[PDB]
Write an enzyme that holds these catalytic residues in place. Sequence first.
Site, PDB file in Angstrom:
ATOM      1  CB  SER A   1      -0.925  -0.065   1.122  1.00 56.12           C
ATOM      2  OG  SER A   1      -2.066   0.685   1.090  1.00 56.12           O
TER       3      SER A   1
ATOM      4  CG  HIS B   1      -5.532  -2.258  -0.772  1.00 56.00           C
ATOM      5  ND1 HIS B   1      -4.621  -1.749  -1.484  1.00 56.00           N
ATOM      6  CD2 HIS B   1      -5.106  -1.410   0.403  1.00 56.00           C
ATOM      7  CE1 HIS B   1      -3.786  -1.037  -1.199  1.00 56.00           C
ATOM      8  NE2 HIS B   1      -4.137  -0.735   0.120  1.00 56.00           N
TER       9      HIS B   1
ATOM     10  CG  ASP C   1      -6.070  -2.471  -4.528  1.00 56.56           C
ATOM     11  OD1 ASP C   1      -6.830  -1.333  -4.138  1.00 56.56           O
ATOM     12  OD2 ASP C   1      -5.027  -2.650  -4.150  1.00 56.56           O
TER      13      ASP C   1
END
Length: 691
Positions: free
Chosen positions: A547, A663, A630
Amino acid sequence: NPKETKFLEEAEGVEALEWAKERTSKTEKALQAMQEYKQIKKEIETIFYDQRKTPYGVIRKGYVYNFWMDDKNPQGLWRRTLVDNYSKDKPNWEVLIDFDKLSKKIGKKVAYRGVSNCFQNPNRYLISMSFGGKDEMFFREWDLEKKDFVKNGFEPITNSGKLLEGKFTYPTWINKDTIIFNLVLHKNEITSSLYPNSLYIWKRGESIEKAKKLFEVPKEYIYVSAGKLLSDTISSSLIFISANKDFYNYDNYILDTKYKNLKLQKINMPSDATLQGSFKEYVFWLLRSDWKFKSHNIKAGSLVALHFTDLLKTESDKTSLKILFTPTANEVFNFISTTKDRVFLATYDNVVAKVVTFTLENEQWTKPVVLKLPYQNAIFGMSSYEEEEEALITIENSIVPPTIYLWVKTHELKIIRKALYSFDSENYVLEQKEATSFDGVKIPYFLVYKKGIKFDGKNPTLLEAYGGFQVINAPYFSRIKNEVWVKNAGVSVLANIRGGGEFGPEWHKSAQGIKRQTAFNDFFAVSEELIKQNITSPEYLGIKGGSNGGLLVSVAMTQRPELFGAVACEVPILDMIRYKEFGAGHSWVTEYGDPEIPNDLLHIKKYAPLENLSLTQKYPTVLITDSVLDQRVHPWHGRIFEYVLAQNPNTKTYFLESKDSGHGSGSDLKESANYFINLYTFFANALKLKI
Ligand SMILES: [Cl-]
Ligand SMILES: [Cl-]
């Protein structure tokens, strides 16, 4: 040109998915051919599918609730057992919802995303769910007596049966027949960050088309949420409405639901102060900035408490405000958690957990009692509710598995569960160390290794950090890293770099926006120190981040390629010129700066990896991961980095695009297991782990 790249901007569809599938298949076949793969697969599967995994839980009304995944139930089981059974090695669990069965029925992965119980009728739950790892989610009402979904109950479907989804749409009970939620009823009811922009109230028996809109935020705001202000045992009718303007600043309100007419009243608190919990009619608020409050300058990072009625009052009229925590230099707030008769205040002092308890006596806060944590380098967690006298506490450290303790009504911890799996902590060392950064600031890091290694610079070493969003990157016990990496004589390192929250809001602000290079420098300071002390050397040093941490490590490998031997860039944000165009990118303008403001862009371009890549430079071998679903950052970031790096014949890259993880590492246990086998095979092979 960017015309060559344009197909990859589309998450789904045609050319991107095929391109990605092919590279993923090549990558998986390559990993599967490495000598280390068979052994790594065995080790990971043993852990992920272990029937001796610790079943963590939460106590409600004499039962412990748990969510369990294994190889038989990779989507998972929501289940419960009497608190008296929870002390047994193998409790008799009552299965409540089997998400694997649900998934089989519908024909798509249905992921469990939490529950909310109705206070007025505690047999009723709203079960939050998503398809795979999407941020978009929905819910269905469910009944404990029936052990089944409620026919025609609360579920966000239209009058044709069409299911409505929204990113982090979560419902809040008003009463047994009424909910409030951040519903996307119409396509346009979203912000520029693509979160729902509206709140609706919805009555039992009525079509969702009849639900009444109560609140809407502007498109430029990030999101709006609703939740309870107090414990339901004190009030079920006071709702906290929180409109997040720019990630760090808010407009907050009390919605009072019990009168003839609804009442919405604006909370007067610092715009970057955040609600952290309640006890009785009092609310706890964390400060991100200094607050000049009457005579006092209440410092950034402090916790204050006040009666909820004083939230609506001017500073002149705020008679109940008290300061409960004033951090010293190395201290930071972690969390508040509440029981029927105690408030637990969890903090860190130099990234070591500290806890105290207190209550109210005669409308005054009592002197706190220290709760002694019997681990070195303790990390603390807990689940509790003001409705319940008892609570479950965890204490652990990076090399000692978590113990679960029952907080009993006589106000003490009693051990309730130890790990059933074996990990010989005495064969390992956990050291808390500091590096010196470019500006003289000390940066903590945590070093874990197996006793008996030599400090000859040849230890395969995995260094991780995050460094953003005021996130505290605490050294928790990782079974996978300890057993797959450190037990095989790899070294593990965690760096508490600036951008994080380990020393409160200033630790974050120091590397925020155009100061991001400070985070990166901190990471280099730790990397260089590992090498200077002959723990490792560049050839044996791998770095891993996801991330925001995916930006970190792609910056690291492009600014300082000579420091590192392997990189894993996981579900990254990394196209820092175009980030606003993808996923929830508008939400982070205050974190990274605005690429359409010249001065911000000038700073961003100094580090942005796609702006600082050379074809003739050898980069460390990198594993890049992303997901079709995502919705946070968008797979564009991973895809473009692979596309550009693929063209550097001096650099070897591995790419893995997941269909439905979103994610994260995988939206069911089997997919997560496969992700970590691929990842650990990559590092073991790159860094020469003796496995
Ligand atoms: Cl639960
Ligand atoms: Cl009903």
